[PDB]
C-alpha cells in the first residue's frame, strides 16, 4: 500500500530522466554540427583541423 506506491513514485522518475537526457544529447549534437560547419568556412581558427580529414585516395604514392 504505502510502501508499494512510494516505490511506484520513486520509479516514476527514471524514464523522464532518460528521455530528457536523450533530448539534451540531440540538442548538443546539433550545436556541434553548427560549430563544425562554421569553422569549415569562416576560415582559419585552428591548429590543423581546417580540412584535411578526407581519406587520401586509392592513389597515395
Amino acid at each position: 500500500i504505502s510502501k508499494l506506491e512510494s516505490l511506484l513514485l520513486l520509479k516514476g522518475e527514471v524514464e523522464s530522466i532518460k528521455k530528457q537526457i536523450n533530448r539534451q544529447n540531440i540538442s548538443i549534437s546539433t550545436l556541434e554540427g553548427h560549430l563544425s560547419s562554421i569553422m569549415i568556412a569562416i576560415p582559419g581558427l585552428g591548429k590543423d583541423p581546417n580540412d584535411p580529414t578526407a581519406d587520401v585516395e586509392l592513389n597515395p604514392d
Binding site: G33, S36, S37, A41, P43, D55
Partner: protein, 1284 residues
C-alpha cells in the same frame, strides 16, 4: 620570314599610347591628351639624356619630312581619333586610285559579258522545279545589271582609297623588314587631286587640300578602316539588289547618317551610345507584348541611361535629347517580326574605341575590394539542396542505394529511413530539414582520369614572366630605368613539349602539399582584349606554368566527374522567360561562400584541401595590367611587394578571375534557383550559354481558358518568382540588378538568334559583311579566298537570303578576286610568263572562274548546294553542273573533252585513303595545311616528354604507307572502307594529335630558325601559288578528244570514266567501287497542283513521287491559339570493335582483323568475336524555315526499292524532302498568308539511268603480306594494349 606575309585583317586592340609614343619620338606636335602622363615624362627624360637607335632615327627622318611639307598650309590643325570618322568614312581621291579602278572596270566588263547567259541558265532550274516558266522581272533586271549597282553604291571611292593604302603599306612593310637589303630610301609625299598622302613603315600621314585638316594613322587603324568600309559596301549592295529589305534599307541608311554625325563633337564616349544599340532592339521588341503591364519596362531604363550619358558631357540641353529620341523611334519602330533581328548585326560597323590601361585597372579594382555581409540560413539551405542533388544523382546509375555515401549524425527520422530503405528524396525534405545536413561527411567514390587526352595541355596560351622579372616586358625606350633581362620561354606548348619529367598526379601533389603558397616564381598579369565595343569591356589573364597546369587539371577533373550529375478539366502548362547575364559573378564570388561546396567536392574526390586554391593564392599576390606602351611610374626596379594600390596595380584582391573554376561556379549557383523555385511554388528550367542565362518558369492551368488569360497568369507568377529570386541572391551576396534583366512572355535570346514563341527570327546579313577579298593565312592563297567566299555565301543563303542573287554575287566576287590576285599583289614570283597571257586573253579568264573546283576550276559553289546541305559526290555534281552550263550556252562544248582528257597528278595510296572522294588533280592542296603538318610532326618527333613516348618514330610514315597499301591494293578497291580503317587505326590517333596541336606564325618561325624546313621545301612553298595558274592555263588550252563521250550520257558514267583514267597508274584497270550517288537537281522533277488541275505534264506514266500539302489562312507572322558491359569501354575498345565491324567477319580474314584490333586493345579472338555485332555485309529534321510547321509530308507512293532489298536510304532519302521543303519555302518567301486555295506539290523521281549493276561480292581476298610494327605500344594515352 621569307614566306610570312604581314597581316591582312585586324586582330589587335587600338591603344592610344602607341600613336602617342610614335608622334612624341618623331617630334610632331599633336593634340592627344592622356590620363597618365608617365609615358610622356619617360620619353622626355630619355630624350634629355640622349638615347637613340635605328627606329628613333627613322622616325626622326619621317618627322622632319612631315614638318617640311606642312609649311604650305598655314592653317592646319590635327584632328584626333575618333573625331575624324565622319571625314575618313567619306574621303575620296581621283589620282592615287588610278591603278585599281581600271582592274575593277575590266572585271565589270568581264561579268557583263556573261551575266545574261548566267540568268538564262538559272531560269531553267526554276522551270524544272515547277515554280513557273519565268522569273520575276525585277529579279531578271538585277541579275543582269548586278555590276552597275555595286559600282554606283556610295562607298566605292572610300573602298578603293583604303584598299590602295592598305596594300601599299603591306608591300612596304614586307619589302623592308627583310634586312638582307640595307639601303633605305626616304619617303616623299605624293600630290594627288584632293589629298596629299605619305606612307612609311609604321606611320601614315594624310593632308586635306581644301579644309587643311591633318590625320596621322597606324597599321591597325588602316586595317580597321578597310574592313569597316568593305563590310558596309557589301551589305548595302546586298540590301539594294534584294527586294525583301525595301524598308530596312532606309532605316539602316538613316542610322548610319545619324550616328556618324555625333563623332566630330562628342568624341570617344560615342561608343557608349553605340553599345546601347544592342539592348535597345530587345526593349523595342518588348512593346509588342500581350500582358500590357510589361510594355516599357526595359525601355524606361535604356532611355534613362542614354539621357545620363548625354548629360555627363556638356549636352545638358533638352532639345538634343528630344531629337535623338525621335530619331531612335523612327529607326526602331517597325511592324514585321523578322525584320527586327537584323539591326542586331550592324552594331559592329562603326569601328572600335581606343583604350588605356588605367581605366581598366580602376574598373576592376572597384570590384576586387568591397566588403560584404551574408546570412547563414540561406547558405545552409543551398548546401542542403546541393547534397540532395548529389544523393539522387548517385542513387541513379546504381539503383536505389547509397553504398559509399554519407554518414549523418542526428538527422530526422525521415532522412534516416530514406537512407536505410534506399529511396530518393525531393527538394522539400532537404529545405524543410536542412539542419540534418550540418555535419554530413561523404567518402571517396570517384576515380581520377590521368590519361584522358591532350587537348587541354596542347591548346596554345601565354605565360607571364617570373615574379623577380615582372617588368621585363616593357622595352628599354619607354622606361626611366633599364630593366633586367628575360630568361624563361613564353609558350605553354613548347614548355610542355620540352618538359623532360611530367606526371599528372604530381601537380596535384604540388597543390595538396601546400608548396604553391611559397613558390617565389608565381605571377599573374592582365592583358587587353581586341574587338570590343566598350572601353572597360573585358581582359584576359596569364599565369605561370605549374599553376596553369593545376588549374587545367582541376577544371577537367570536375567537368569529367561529378559535373555530369547536373544534366541541366484537362490541365496543361504555360511558361514565361527571364533573361540575364552572368559576368561579374566571377568578381562577386568569395571564399566564405565557395568553401562549403569545395569541401564536399574534396571529401568526394579524395584530394584534401584542393578545390579552394584560387582564393587561397590570390589573397596574397599582387596583380597588374601589362601593356608594352603603358609603363609604370617608378624610378628603379623594386619588388612587386612595394608598389602602391594604384594606377596599374591591384594589391591583394578578393574575388575570382573570369574563365577559371567556371564549372565549380555554375554547379554551385543552381541550388539557389531551385530554392527560390520551391519558395515561390513553381517549376523552372535553366539554361546557360556563355555569359547569358535563361530561366523558363512553368505553371499548370486548365485548357479551355483563353490565350490572354493563360499568358497573363504565367507572367504574374513569373514576376513573383523573379522578386523572390532577387531577394534570395542578395543574401549570399550577388547582384541581380533591378533594371538589367528582361522578363518576357514571348521570347528569349540564345546563341543563334532570337527565339520568338515557337519560331526563330533570321540574321541573314551577318556573313555578307564578312565575305571579303582575302582570308587569314600565313600566305596569300586564291583558292582559300574563293572557298571562304563560297562558304560565307552558302551560310547566308541558309538563313533567308535569295538563292539566285547569292549565286550571282558569288560569281562576281570570284571574278574580281582572281583579277585582284593576278594584277594587284605584293607577291614577287608573278612574272610575265603567266600574268601577261592571262590578263590579255579574256574568255580564258571567264572559263577559269566559272569551271567548278573539284575538276580543275576555281568556283566552289555547286547548284545543288543552294538547295540541299550536303551533296552526294562532288565529282558527279560538278560534271552535272558543267553539262547544265554547256546546255545553257555559258561555256563552249570542248570544255568537257578538255576536262576529261586533262593530265593526271601523282599521289600515293596514303593520300588516296586519307581523301577518298578526291580525283588526282595537280597542285590543289593548301600551303598553310602542308606547312603545319610538317612542322607539327617534326616538333613532335623530338620531344622527351614521358607522356608521349614510343608514339613517334622516324619510320611512322613508312609504316603508314605500307598499311595503306596492304589495305587498298586488292583486286577491288574500296576507298571509303580503307579511309575508315586507317582513321580508326593508330595512324589516325597520331595524325589527330598532330592536327589538334595548333601551331601559328610564332612556332613556325621558331622551328624554321631551328632548321625544320629545308631550302627546297621553302622555295617550293614560296612558288606554290603561280604553279596553280600555270596548271589551269595548260588545262584550259589543251586540245584532245575522247570519241567515246557524248554530252547526253549520264553523269555517273562520266565520273566513272574520269576516275578510271585519273587513277590509271595505281588501279591498273581494276574497278573502283562504291563512290558515287546520283545528283539531286538532275533526277527530280516538280509540279504544283491547285484548284482543279491534275499533274498532267508529269503524269505521262511516272507514278512514284513525294507528296506535299499545306492549307492555311492569315499566318506566317504570329500564332494565336553484344555484351557492352557498362565499363570504361569508351577508352579504346570502342575503336577496337568499330574497326573489326568495318572490316567484316569472313572466313579467314578474321585473323588479320584480330591482328589489327589487338594492335589497339587487349582482347582475344573469341572475346572480340562475341563482343562484335554482325551486319548485312563487310560494312527528318528541318532548318530555319517558316512554312515547314504547316505542311503534311507523305511518301506512301514512293518507297520503291531498287536493288531489291529493304536497305539504308538507297538514294539519300532525306534529300528529297529537304528539296521539297526548300521549294515550298522559296514559293511562299515574300508574301503574308498562304492564300485562298490549297496548294499540293508532287515531287517525281526517276533514277533509272543512274543505276550500277554492282555485285555484292562475299569478300575480297588480300594479295600482300601483312607486316606491322614488331612490338606494340603500351602507352595508355594512345589505344593501349593492356586495358582489359
Amino acid at each position: 620570314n621569307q614566306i610570312l606575309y604581314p597581316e591582312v585583317h585586324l586582330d589587335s586592340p587600338i591603344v592610344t599610347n602607341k600613336i602617342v609614343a610614335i608622334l612624341e619620338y618623331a617630334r610632331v606636335p599633336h593634340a592627344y591628351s592622356l590620363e597618365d602622363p608617365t609615358l610622356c615624362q619617360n620619353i622626355k627624360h630619355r630624350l634629355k639624356n640622349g638615347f637613340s637607335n635605328q627606329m628613333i632615327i627613322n622616325n626622326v627622318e619621317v618627322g622632319n619630312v612631315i614638318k617640311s611639307k606642312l609649311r604650305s598650309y598655314p592653317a592646319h590643325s590635327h584632328i584626333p581619333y575618333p573625331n575624324c570618322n565622319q571625314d575618313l568614312f567619306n574621303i575620296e581621291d581621283k589620282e592615287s586610285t588610278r591603278k585599281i579602278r581600271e582592274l575593277l572596270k575590266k572585271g565589270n566588263s568581264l561579268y557583263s559579258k556573261v551575266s545574261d547567259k548566267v540568268f538564262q541558265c538559272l531560269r531553267d532550274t526554276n522551270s524544272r522545279l515547277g515554280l513557273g516558266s519565268e522569273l520575276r522581272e525585277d529579279i531578271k533586271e538585277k541579275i543582269i545589271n548586278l555590276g552597275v549597282y555595286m559600282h554606283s553604291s556610295q562607298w566605292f571611292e572610300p573602298f578603293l582609297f583604303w584598299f590602295t593604302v592598305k596594300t601599299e603599306m603591306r608591300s612596304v612593310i614586307k619589302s623592308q623588314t627583310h634586312t638582307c637589303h640595307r639601303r633605305r630610301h626616304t619617303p616623299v609625299f605624293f600630290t594627288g587631286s584632293s589629298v596629299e598622302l605619305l606612307i612609311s613603315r609604321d606611320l601614315v600621314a594624310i593632308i586635306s587640300k581644301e579644309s587643311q585638316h591633318v590625320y596621322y594613322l597606324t597599321f591597325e587603324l588602316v586595317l580597321m578602316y578597310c574592313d569597316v568600309i568593305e563590310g558596309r559596301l557589301m551589305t548595302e549592295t546586298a540590301m539594294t539588289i534584294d527586294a525583301r529589305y525595301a524598308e530596312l534599307l532606309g532605316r539602316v541608311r538613316y542610322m548610319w547618317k545619324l550616328i556618324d554625325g555625333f563623332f566630330p563633337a562628342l568624341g570617344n564616349p560615342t561608343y557608349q551610345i553605340v553599345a546601347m544599340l544592342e539592348p535597345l532592339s530587345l526593349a523595342y521588341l518588348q512593346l509588342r507584348d500581350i500582358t500590357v503591364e510589361l510594355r516599357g519596362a526595359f525601355l524606361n531604363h535604356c532611355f534613362t541611361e542614354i539621357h545620363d550619358v548625354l548629360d555627363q558631357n556638356g549636352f545638358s540641353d533638352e532639345g538634343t535629347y528630344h531629337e535623338l529620341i525621335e530619331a531612335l523611334d523612327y529607326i526602331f519602330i517597325t511592324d514585321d517580326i523578322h525584320l527586327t533581328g537584323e539591326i542586331f548585326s550592324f552594331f559592329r560597323s562603326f569601328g572600335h574605341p581606343r583604350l588605356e590601361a588605367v581605366t581598366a585597372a580602376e574598373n576592376v579594382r572597384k570590384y576586387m575590394n568591397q566588403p560584404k555581409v551574408i546570412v547563414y540560413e540561406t547558405l545552409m539551405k543551398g548546401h542542403a539542396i546541393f547534397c540532395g542533388i548529389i544523393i539522387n544523382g548517385y542513387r541513379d546509375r546504381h539503383g536505389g542505394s547509397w553504398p559509399p555515401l554519407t554518414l549523418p549524425l542526428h538527422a530526422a527520422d525521415t532522412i534516416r529511413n530514406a537512407q536505410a530503405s534506399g529511396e530518393g528524396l525531393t527538394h522539400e525534405q532537404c529545405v524543410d530539414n536542412w539542419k540534418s545536413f550540418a555535419g554530413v561527411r561523404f567518402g571517396c567514390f570517384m576515380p581520377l582520369s590521368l590519361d584522358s587526352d591532350l587537348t587541354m595541355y596542347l591548346k596554345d596560351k601565354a605565360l607571364a614572366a617570373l615574379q623577380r622579372e615582372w617588368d621585363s616586358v616593357y622595352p628599354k625606350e619607354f622606361l626611366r630605368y633599364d630593366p633586367p633581362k628575360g630568361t624563361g620561354s613564353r609558350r605553354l606548348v613548347d614548355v610542355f613539349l620540352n618538359d623532360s619529367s611530367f606526371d599528372p598526379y604530381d601537380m596535384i601533389m604540388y597543390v595538396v602539399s601546400g608548396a604553391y603558397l611559397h613558390d617565389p616564381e608565381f605571377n599573374l598579369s592582365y592583358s587587353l582584349k581586341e574587338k570590343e565595343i566598350k572601353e572597360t569591356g573585358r581582359l584576359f589573364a596569364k599565369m605561370t606554368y605549374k599553376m596553369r597546369a593545376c588549374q587545367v587539371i582541376a577544371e577537367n577533373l570536375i567537368s569529367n566527374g561529378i559535373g555530369k550529375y547536373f544534366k541541366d478539366e484537362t490541365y496543361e502548362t504555360v511558361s514565361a522567360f527571364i533573361t540575364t547575364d552572368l559576368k561579374k559573378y566571377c568578381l562577386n564570388w568569395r571564399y566564405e561562400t565557395i568553401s562549403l561546396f569545395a569541401q564536399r567536392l574534396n571529401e568526394i574526390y579524395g584530394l584534401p584541401s584542393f578545390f579552394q586554391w584560387l582564393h587561397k593564392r590570390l589573397e596574397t599576390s599582387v596583380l597588374y595590367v601589362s601593356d608594352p606602351h603603358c609603363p609604370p611610374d617608378l624610378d628603379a626596379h623594386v619588388p612587386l611587394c612595394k608598389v602602391p594600390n594604384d594606377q596599374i596595380f591591384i594589391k591583394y584582391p578578393m574575388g575570382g578571375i573570369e574563365g577559371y573554376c567556371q564549372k565549380l561556379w555554375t554547379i554551385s549557383t543552381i541550388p539557389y534557383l531551385y530554392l527560390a523555385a520551391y519558395e515561390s511554388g513553381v517549376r523552372i528550367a535553366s539554361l546557360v550559354q556563355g555569359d547569358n542565362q535563361t530561366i523558363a518558369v512553368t505553371k499548370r492551368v486548365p485548357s479551355t481558358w483563353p490565350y490572354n488569360l493563360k499568358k497573363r497568369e504565367a507572367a504574374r507568377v513569373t514576376r513573383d518568382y523573379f522578386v523572390i529570386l532577387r531577394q534570395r541572391l542578395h543574401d549570399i551576396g550577388h547582384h541581380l540588378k533591378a533594371n538589367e534583366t528582361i522578363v518576357s512572355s514571348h521570347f528569349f535570346v540564345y546563341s543563334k538568334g532570337i527565339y520568338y514563341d515557337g519560331l526563330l527570327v533570321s540574321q541573314s546579313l551577318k556573313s555578307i559583311a564578312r565575305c571579303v577579298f582575302w582570308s587569314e593565312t600565313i600566305v596569300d592563297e586564291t583558292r582559300a579566298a574563293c572557298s571562304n567566299i563560297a562558304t560565307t555565301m552558302a551560310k547566308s543563303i541558309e538563313r533567308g537570303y535569295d538563292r539566285y542573287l547569292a549565286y550571282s554575287l558569288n560569281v562576281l566576287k570570284v571574278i574580281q578576286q582572281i583579277l585582284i590576285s593576278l594584277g594587284f599583289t605584293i607577291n614577287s614570283t608573278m612574272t610575265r610568263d603567266v600574268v601577261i597571257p592571262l590578263l590579255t586573253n579574256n574568255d580564258l579568264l571567264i572559263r577559269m572562274a566559272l569551271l567548278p573546283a573539284p575538276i580543275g576550276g576555281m568556283n566552289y559553289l555547286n547548284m545543288s548546294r543552294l538547295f540541299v546541305r550536303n551533296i552526294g559526290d562532288p565529282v558527279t555534281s560538278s560534271i552535272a553542273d558543267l553539262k547544265r552550263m554547256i546546255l545553257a550556252s555559258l561555256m563552249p562544248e570542248e570544255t568537257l573533252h578538255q576536262v576529261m582528257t586533262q593530265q593526271p597528278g601523282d599521289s600515293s595510296f596514303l593520300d588516296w585513303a586519307s581523301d577518298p572522294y578526291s580525283a588526282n588533280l595537280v597542285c590543289v592542296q593548301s600551303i598553310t595545311r602542308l606547312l603545319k603538318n610538317i612542322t607539327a610532326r617534326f616538333v613532335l618527333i623530338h620531344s622527351p616528354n614521358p607522356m608521349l613516348k614510343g608514339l613517334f618514330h622516324d619510320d611512322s610514315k613508312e609504316e603508314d604507307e605500307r598499311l595503306a597499301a596492304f589495305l587498298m591494293d586488292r583486286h577491288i578497291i574500296v576507298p571509303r572502307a580503307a579511309h575508315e580503317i586507317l582513321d580508326h587505326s593508330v595512324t589516325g590517333a597520331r595524325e589527330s594529335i598532330a592536327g589538334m596541336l595548333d601551331t601559328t606564325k610564332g612556332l613556325i618561325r621558331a622551328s624554321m630558325r631551328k632548321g625544320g624546313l629545308t631550302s627546297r621545301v621553302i622555295t617550293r612553298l614560296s612558288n606554290y601559288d603561280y604553279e596553280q595558274f600555270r596548271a589551269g592555263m595548260v588545262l584550259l588550252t589543251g586540245r584532245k578528244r575522247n570519241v567515246l563521250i557524248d554530252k547526253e550520257s549520264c553523269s555517273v558514267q562520266l565520273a566513272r570514266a574520269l576516275r578510271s583514267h585519273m587513277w590509271a597508274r595505281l588501279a591498273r584497270g581494276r574497278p573502283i567501287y562504291g563512290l558515287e550517288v546520283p545528283d539531286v537537281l538532275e533526277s527530280m522533277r516538280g509540279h504544283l497542283i491547285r484548284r482543279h488541275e491534275t499533274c498532267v505534264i508529269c503524269e505521262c506514266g511516272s507514278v512514284n513521287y513525294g507528296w506535299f500539302f499545306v492549307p492555311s489562312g492569315c499566318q506566317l507572322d504570329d500564332i494565336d491559339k553484344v555484351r557492352a558491359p557498362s565499363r570504361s569501354l569508351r577508352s579504346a575498345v570502342r575503336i577496337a570493335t568499330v574497326y573489326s565491324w568495318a572490316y567484316g567477319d569472313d572466313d579467314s580474314s578474321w585473323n588479320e582483323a584480330w591482328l589489327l584490333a589487338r594492335q589497339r586493345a587487349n582482347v582475344s579472338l573469341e572475346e572480340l568475336r562475341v563482343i562484335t555485332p554482325i551486319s548485312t555485309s563487310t560494312n527528318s529534321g528541318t532548318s530555319l524555315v517558316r512554312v515547314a510547321r504547316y505542311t503534311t509530308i507523305s511518301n506512301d507512293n514512293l518507297s520503291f526499292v531498287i536493288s531489291d532489298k529493304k536497305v539504308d536510304t538507297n538514294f539519300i532519302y532525306q534529300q528529297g524532302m529537304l528539296l521539297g521543303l526548300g521549294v515550298l519555302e522559296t514559293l511562299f518567301r515574300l508574301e503574308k498568308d498562304t492564300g485562298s486555295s490549297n496548294t499540293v506539290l508532287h515531287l517525281h523521281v526517276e533514277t533509272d539511268c543512274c543505276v550500277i549493276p554492282m555485285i555484292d561480292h562475299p569478300r575480297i581476298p588480300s594479295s600482300r603480306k601483312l607486316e606491322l610494327r614488331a612490338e606494340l605500344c603500351t602507352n595508355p594515352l594512345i589505344y593501349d594494349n593492356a586495358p582489359l
